[PDB]
Design a protein around this motif. Structure first.
Motif, PDB file in Angstrom:
ATOM      1  N   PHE A  17       0.833  -1.191   0.000  1.00  0.00           N
ATOM      2  CA  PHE A  17       0.000   0.000   0.000  1.00  0.00           C
ATOM      3  C   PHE A  17       0.868   1.242   0.000  1.00  0.00           C
ATOM      4  O   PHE A  17       0.768   2.089  -0.899  1.00  0.00           O
ATOM      5  CB  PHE A  17      -0.923  -0.008   1.214  1.00  0.00           C
ATOM      6  CG  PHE A  17      -1.737   1.241   1.372  1.00  0.00           C
ATOM      7  CD1 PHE A  17      -2.908   1.416   0.660  1.00  0.00           C
ATOM      8  CD2 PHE A  17      -1.326   2.243   2.232  1.00  0.00           C
ATOM      9  CE1 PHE A  17      -3.660   2.560   0.817  1.00  0.00           C
ATOM     10  CE2 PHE A  17      -2.077   3.391   2.381  1.00  0.00           C
ATOM     11  CZ  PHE A  17      -3.244   3.549   1.674  1.00  0.00           C
ATOM     12  N   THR A  18       1.803   1.314   0.951  1.00  0.00           N
ATOM     13  CA  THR A  18       2.672   2.477   1.039  1.00  0.00           C
ATOM     14  C   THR A  18       3.409   2.681  -0.277  1.00  0.00           C
ATOM     15  O   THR A  18       3.326   3.753  -0.881  1.00  0.00           O
ATOM     16  CB  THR A  18       3.655   2.316   2.195  1.00  0.00           C
ATOM     17  OG1 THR A  18       2.938   2.040   3.397  1.00  0.00           O
ATOM     18  CG2 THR A  18       4.461   3.573   2.393  1.00  0.00           C
ATOM     19  N   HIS A  21       1.055   4.006  -2.811  1.00  0.00           N
ATOM     20  CA  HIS A  21       0.548   5.353  -2.590  1.00  0.00           C
ATOM     21  C   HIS A  21       1.568   6.381  -3.048  1.00  0.00           C
ATOM     22  O   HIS A  21       1.355   7.094  -4.036  1.00  0.00           O
ATOM     23  CB  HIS A  21       0.207   5.536  -1.112  1.00  0.00           C
ATOM     24  CG  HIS A  21      -0.762   6.638  -0.834  1.00  0.00           C
ATOM     25  ND1 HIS A  21      -0.624   7.516   0.214  1.00  0.00           N
ATOM     26  CD2 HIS A  21      -1.905   6.979  -1.478  1.00  0.00           C
ATOM     27  CE1 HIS A  21      -1.632   8.374   0.200  1.00  0.00           C
ATOM     28  NE2 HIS A  21      -2.433   8.066  -0.828  1.00  0.00           N
ATOM     29  N   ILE A  22       2.723   6.394  -2.383  1.00  0.00           N
ATOM     30  CA  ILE A  22       3.818   7.286  -2.716  1.00  0.00           C
ATOM     31  C   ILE A  22       4.048   7.271  -4.215  1.00  0.00           C
ATOM     32  O   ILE A  22       3.966   8.321  -4.858  1.00  0.00           O
ATOM     33  CB  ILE A  22       5.100   6.910  -1.954  1.00  0.00           C
ATOM     34  CG1 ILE A  22       4.879   7.021  -0.445  1.00  0.00           C
ATOM     35  CG2 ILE A  22       6.262   7.774  -2.402  1.00  0.00           C
ATOM     36  CD1 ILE A  22       5.881   6.265   0.372  1.00  0.00           C
ATOM     37  N   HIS A  25       1.591   9.138  -6.478  1.00  0.00           N
ATOM     38  CA  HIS A  25       1.752  10.580  -6.404  1.00  0.00           C
ATOM     39  C   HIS A  25       2.935  11.034  -7.244  1.00  0.00           C
ATOM     40  O   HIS A  25       2.780  11.847  -8.161  1.00  0.00           O
ATOM     41  CB  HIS A  25       1.921  11.017  -4.950  1.00  0.00           C
ATOM     42  CG  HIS A  25       2.118  12.488  -4.776  1.00  0.00           C
ATOM     43  ND1 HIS A  25       3.358  13.065  -4.668  1.00  0.00           N
ATOM     44  CD2 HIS A  25       1.212  13.498  -4.698  1.00  0.00           C
ATOM     45  CE1 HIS A  25       3.223  14.374  -4.524  1.00  0.00           C
ATOM     46  NE2 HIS A  25       1.918  14.663  -4.541  1.00  0.00           N
ATOM     47  N   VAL A  26       4.110  10.446  -7.012  1.00  0.00           N
ATOM     48  CA  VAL A  26       5.254  10.918  -7.777  1.00  0.00           C
ATOM     49  C   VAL A  26       5.040  10.598  -9.249  1.00  0.00           C
ATOM     50  O   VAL A  26       5.202  11.473 -10.110  1.00  0.00           O
ATOM     51  CB  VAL A  26       6.585  10.367  -7.233  1.00  0.00           C
ATOM     52  CG1 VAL A  26       6.802  10.817  -5.803  1.00  0.00           C
ATOM     53  CG2 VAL A  26       6.660   8.864  -7.319  1.00  0.00           C
ATOM     54  N   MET A  29       2.991  13.490 -10.388  1.00  0.00           N
ATOM     55  CA  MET A  29       3.500  14.856 -10.344  1.00  0.00           C
ATOM     56  C   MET A  29       4.735  15.009 -11.225  1.00  0.00           C
ATOM     57  O   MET A  29       4.798  15.906 -12.073  1.00  0.00           O
ATOM     58  CB  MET A  29       3.818  15.260  -8.907  1.00  0.00           C
ATOM     59  CG  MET A  29       2.683  15.035  -7.940  1.00  0.00           C
ATOM     60  SD  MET A  29       1.421  16.308  -8.101  1.00  0.00           S
ATOM     61  CE  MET A  29      -0.067  15.313  -8.083  1.00  0.00           C
TER      62      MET A  29
ATOM     63  N   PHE B   3      -1.457   5.352   9.800  1.00  0.00           N
ATOM     64  CA  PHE B   3      -1.387   3.901   9.809  1.00  0.00           C
ATOM     65  C   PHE B   3      -1.881   3.413  11.166  1.00  0.00           C
ATOM     66  O   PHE B   3      -1.256   3.658  12.197  1.00  0.00           O
ATOM     67  CB  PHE B   3       0.033   3.419   9.539  1.00  0.00           C
ATOM     68  CG  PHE B   3       0.515   3.686   8.146  1.00  0.00           C
ATOM     69  CD1 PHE B   3       1.015   4.923   7.794  1.00  0.00           C
ATOM     70  CD2 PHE B   3       0.468   2.700   7.184  1.00  0.00           C
ATOM     71  CE1 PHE B   3       1.452   5.174   6.512  1.00  0.00           C
ATOM     72  CE2 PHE B   3       0.929   2.940   5.904  1.00  0.00           C
ATOM     73  CZ  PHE B   3       1.411   4.183   5.571  1.00  0.00           C
TER      74      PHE B   3
ATOM     75  N   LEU C  15       6.125   2.321   9.665  1.00  0.00           N
ATOM     76  CA  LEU C  15       5.525   2.714   8.396  1.00  0.00           C
ATOM     77  C   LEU C  15       5.112   4.178   8.428  1.00  0.00           C
ATOM     78  O   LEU C  15       5.307   4.909   7.453  1.00  0.00           O
ATOM     79  CB  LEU C  15       4.311   1.832   8.089  1.00  0.00           C
ATOM     80  CG  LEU C  15       4.552   0.509   7.377  1.00  0.00           C
ATOM     81  CD1 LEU C  15       3.323  -0.359   7.505  1.00  0.00           C
ATOM     82  CD2 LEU C  15       4.909   0.738   5.931  1.00  0.00           C
ATOM     83  N   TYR C  19       6.692   6.898   5.841  1.00  0.00           N
ATOM     84  CA  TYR C  19       5.785   7.648   4.985  1.00  0.00           C
ATOM     85  C   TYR C  19       5.875   9.137   5.272  1.00  0.00           C
ATOM     86  O   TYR C  19       5.874   9.947   4.342  1.00  0.00           O
ATOM     87  CB  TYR C  19       4.351   7.167   5.164  1.00  0.00           C
ATOM     88  CG  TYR C  19       3.358   7.917   4.310  1.00  0.00           C
ATOM     89  CD1 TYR C  19       3.110   7.535   3.007  1.00  0.00           C
ATOM     90  CD2 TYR C  19       2.674   9.016   4.801  1.00  0.00           C
ATOM     91  CE1 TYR C  19       2.202   8.213   2.220  1.00  0.00           C
ATOM     92  CE2 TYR C  19       1.780   9.714   4.023  1.00  0.00           C
ATOM     93  CZ  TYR C  19       1.548   9.312   2.730  1.00  0.00           C
ATOM     94  OH  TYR C  19       0.655  10.003   1.955  1.00  0.00           O
ATOM     95  N   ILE C  22       9.221  10.569   3.761  1.00  0.00           N
ATOM     96  CA  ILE C  22       9.155  10.658   2.308  1.00  0.00           C
ATOM     97  C   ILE C  22       8.188  11.760   1.897  1.00  0.00           C
ATOM     98  O   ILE C  22       8.475  12.542   0.986  1.00  0.00           O
ATOM     99  CB  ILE C  22       8.760   9.306   1.690  1.00  0.00           C
ATOM    100  CG1 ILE C  22       9.855   8.269   1.944  1.00  0.00           C
ATOM    101  CG2 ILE C  22       8.495   9.450   0.204  1.00  0.00           C
ATOM    102  CD1 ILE C  22       9.421   6.850   1.741  1.00  0.00           C
ATOM    103  N   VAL C  26       9.160  15.081  -0.303  1.00  0.00           N
ATOM    104  CA  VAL C  26       8.522  15.259  -1.597  1.00  0.00           C
ATOM    105  C   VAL C  26       7.727  16.559  -1.627  1.00  0.00           C
ATOM    106  O   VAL C  26       7.780  17.320  -2.596  1.00  0.00           O
ATOM    107  CB  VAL C  26       7.648  14.041  -1.929  1.00  0.00           C
ATOM    108  CG1 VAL C  26       6.703  14.353  -3.071  1.00  0.00           C
ATOM    109  CG2 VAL C  26       8.519  12.854  -2.277  1.00  0.00           C
ATOM    110  N   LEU C  30       8.724  19.448  -4.353  1.00  0.00           N
ATOM    111  CA  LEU C  30       7.760  19.796  -5.388  1.00  0.00           C
ATOM    112  C   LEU C  30       7.147  21.171  -5.156  1.00  0.00           C
ATOM    113  O   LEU C  30       6.825  21.881  -6.111  1.00  0.00           O
ATOM    114  CB  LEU C  30       6.681  18.716  -5.485  1.00  0.00           C
ATOM    115  CG  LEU C  30       7.055  17.467  -6.287  1.00  0.00           C
ATOM    116  CD1 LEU C  30       8.073  16.590  -5.592  1.00  0.00           C
ATOM    117  CD2 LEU C  30       5.801  16.678  -6.557  1.00  0.00           C
TER     118      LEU C  30
END
Lengths: 39, 45, 39
Positions: A17-18, A21-22, A25-26, A29, B3, C15, C19, C22, C26, C30
Motif C-alpha cells: 500500500f505504502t 501510494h507514494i 503521487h510521484v 507529479m 497507519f 511505516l 511515509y 518521504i 517530496v 515539489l
C-alpha cells in the motif's frame, strides 16, 4: 476441498500500500513536470 | 496518512490456538482438594 | 484504574515514520519546484 493457510504478517500488504501510494503521487507529479517542461 | 495498528493474530489468539494449556490445567486440577474436600478437618475417634 | 494493552507489532509506527519522512521531502521539493516554475 482444501484449507487455506493465512500468513501471520500482514505487513507486506501494508508495505505494498505504502509503496503504491507514494509512487502514484510521484508518478503523477513528476509526469506533469515533464509535460510542463516540454510545452 | 495515518497507519492504524493492524495484525492478523494477536498474542491472545496465538496462545488460545493451543488445545491444552499446562498452566490452566494445573491451576484447575490443584484446586480439587480445596473445592471438593475439607483439608482442615481432622477426625480422631 | 485500568490496564493499558499494547499491540505486538510496532511496524505501523515505523511505516508512519517512513511515509512521513518521504512525504515531507517530496512536498518540500515539489513545492519549491512549483514556486520556481511560477517565478
Amino acid at each position: 476441498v482444501e484449507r487455506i493457510k493465512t500468513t501471520s504478517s500482514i505487513e507486506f500488504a501494508r508495505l505494498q500500500f505504502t509503496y503504491n501510494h507514494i509512487q502514484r503521487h510521484v508518478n503523477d507529479m513528476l509526469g506533469r513536470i515533464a509535460v510542463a517542461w516540454c510545452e | 496518512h495515518e497507519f492504524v495498528p493492524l495484525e492478523v493474530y494477536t498474542r491472545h489468539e496465538i496462545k488460545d490456538s493451543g488445545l491444552l494449556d499446562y498452566t490452566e490445567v494445573q491451576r484447575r486440577n490443584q484446586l480439587h482438594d480445596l473445592r471438593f474436600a475439607d483439608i482442615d478437618t481432622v477426625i480422631r475417634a
